[PDB]
Write a protein that holds these residues in place. Sequence first.
Motif, PDB file in Angstrom:
ATOM      1  N   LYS A   1     113.402  20.245 128.295  1.00  0.00           N
ATOM      2  CA  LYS A   1     114.517  20.554 129.231  1.00  0.00           C
ATOM      3  C   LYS A   1     114.089  21.613 130.258  1.00  0.00           C
ATOM      4  O   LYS A   1     113.271  22.494 129.958  1.00  0.00           O
ATOM      5  N   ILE A   2     114.632  21.509 131.473  1.00  0.00           N
ATOM      6  CA  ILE A   2     114.332  22.460 132.548  1.00  0.00           C
ATOM      7  C   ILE A   2     115.631  23.065 133.103  1.00  0.00           C
ATOM      8  O   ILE A   2     116.437  22.364 133.732  1.00  0.00           O
ATOM      9  N   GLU A   3     115.829  24.361 132.868  1.00  0.00           N
ATOM     10  CA  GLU A   3     117.029  25.047 133.351  1.00  0.00           C
ATOM     11  C   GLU A   3     116.679  25.953 134.525  1.00  0.00           C
ATOM     12  O   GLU A   3     115.639  26.623 134.511  1.00  0.00           O
ATOM     13  N   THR A   4     117.548  26.010 135.529  1.00  0.00           N
ATOM     14  CA  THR A   4     117.250  26.819 136.695  1.00  0.00           C
ATOM     15  C   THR A   4     118.480  27.193 137.534  1.00  0.00           C
ATOM     16  O   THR A   4     119.471  26.459 137.600  1.00  0.00           O
ATOM     17  N   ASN A   5     118.390  28.341 138.197  1.00  0.00           N
ATOM     18  CA  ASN A   5     119.459  28.833 139.056  1.00  0.00           C
ATOM     19  C   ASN A   5     119.476  28.129 140.404  1.00  0.00           C
ATOM     20  O   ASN A   5     118.432  27.843 140.975  1.00  0.00           O
ATOM     21  N   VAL A   6     120.669  27.826 140.900  1.00  0.00           N
ATOM     22  CA  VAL A   6     120.829  27.210 142.204  1.00  0.00           C
ATOM     23  C   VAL A   6     121.677  28.223 142.986  1.00  0.00           C
ATOM     24  O   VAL A   6     122.856  28.438 142.679  1.00  0.00           O
ATOM     25  N   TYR A   7     121.061  28.889 143.962  1.00  0.00           N
ATOM     26  CA  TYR A   7     121.752  29.904 144.766  1.00  0.00           C
ATOM     27  C   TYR A   7     122.545  29.283 145.888  1.00  0.00           C
ATOM     28  O   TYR A   7     122.041  28.493 146.687  1.00  0.00           O
ATOM     29  N   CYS A   8     123.809  29.651 145.928  1.00  0.00           N
ATOM     30  CA  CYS A   8     124.717  29.098 146.894  1.00  0.00           C
ATOM     31  C   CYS A   8     125.373  30.222 147.647  1.00  0.00           C
ATOM     32  O   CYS A   8     125.964  31.119 147.050  1.00  0.00           O
ATOM     33  N   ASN A   9     125.284  30.148 148.970  1.00  0.00           N
ATOM     34  CA  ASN A   9     125.874  31.132 149.852  1.00  0.00           C
ATOM     35  C   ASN A   9     127.372  30.850 149.947  1.00  0.00           C
ATOM     36  O   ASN A   9     127.799  29.697 149.943  1.00  0.00           O
ATOM     37  N   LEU A  10     128.155  31.916 150.019  1.00  0.00           N
ATOM     38  CA  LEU A  10     129.586  31.793 150.173  1.00  0.00           C
ATOM     39  C   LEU A  10     129.818  31.382 151.632  1.00  0.00           C
ATOM     40  O   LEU A  10     129.000  31.672 152.510  1.00  0.00           O
ATOM     41  N   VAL A 176     118.982  20.863 134.001  1.00  0.00           N
ATOM     42  CA  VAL A 176     120.077  21.840 134.042  1.00  0.00           C
ATOM     43  C   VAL A 176     120.140  22.676 135.320  1.00  0.00           C
ATOM     44  O   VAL A 176     119.119  23.182 135.790  1.00  0.00           O
ATOM     45  N   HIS A 177     121.337  22.815 135.894  1.00  0.00           N
ATOM     46  CA  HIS A 177     121.526  23.621 137.105  1.00  0.00           C
ATOM     47  C   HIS A 177     122.606  24.703 136.922  1.00  0.00           C
ATOM     48  O   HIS A 177     123.740  24.417 136.505  1.00  0.00           O
ATOM     49  N   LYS A 178     122.291  25.940 137.256  1.00  0.00           N
ATOM     50  CA  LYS A 178     123.301  27.001 137.137  1.00  0.00           C
ATOM     51  C   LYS A 178     123.633  27.462 138.529  1.00  0.00           C
ATOM     52  O   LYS A 178     122.779  28.044 139.193  1.00  0.00           O
ATOM     53  N   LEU A 179     124.865  27.215 138.977  1.00  0.00           N
ATOM     54  CA  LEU A 179     125.240  27.628 140.304  1.00  0.00           C
ATOM     55  C   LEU A 179     125.485  29.138 140.317  1.00  0.00           C
ATOM     56  O   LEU A 179     126.188  29.663 139.446  1.00  0.00           O
ATOM     57  N   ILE A 180     124.938  29.832 141.309  1.00  0.00           N
ATOM     58  CA  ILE A 180     125.113  31.290 141.417  1.00  0.00           C
ATOM     59  C   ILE A 180     125.449  31.701 142.828  1.00  0.00           C
ATOM     60  O   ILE A 180     124.699  31.368 143.754  1.00  0.00           O
TER      61      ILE A 180
END
Length: 230
Positions: A1-10, A176-180
């Motif tokens: 499995k590959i988990e990682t942060n996905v940076y999202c601008n407001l 896996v994607h973690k929205l931040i």
Amino acid sequence: KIETNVYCNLTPEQAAMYKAEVENLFNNIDSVTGIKRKGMILSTLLKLKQIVDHPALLKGGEQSVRRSGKMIRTMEIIEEALDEGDKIAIFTQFVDMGKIIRNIIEKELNTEVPFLYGELSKKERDDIISKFQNNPSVKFIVLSVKAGGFGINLTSANRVIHFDRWWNPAVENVIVHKLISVGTLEEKIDQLLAFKRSLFKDIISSGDSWITELSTEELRKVIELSVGGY
């Protein structure tokens, strides 16, 4: 499995709401102490978490992709994933965000998006889980896990998007994607855990508790918007 942060601008709208609420908290936080201070911080934390997900959770209005940095990245991830033939599961800690996500996807992609939430009867739930797990056609499932609720392990999902930090800190191939949200408390908290989990290893279980007990200066470091221009 590959988990990682996905940076999202407001979006500008989101950044403005985020900033106002942070200013409102610091304008009145000195007056109270103890119990009332804890509860004041709690309310602000709640609003900020909702603002970084979608302005409509607090202002109603159009439930569009456009109003949310996260929703905008989510449709991008979805596009790439469907093309790979992925079955996608999206988690959020808010039942209302779950409905918005579900509405947007059903509308824009014209496909069925089963929605799991705590109030569902057992059968509605089991039936939905069975439907996602056994029918390759069903490409999506949205889950809202409230605080005090538990996750689920949907093995048929090829892609998982954690829309916001709904999971238990202590615990914490499928892509896996973690929205931040860039420059917000979501980024700060993530950075803090990943730095020296050892320091938090005690306090980590009891949730946001540690946050409601920070000094006013420490608190500002955690929640103030640190975006260029602001």
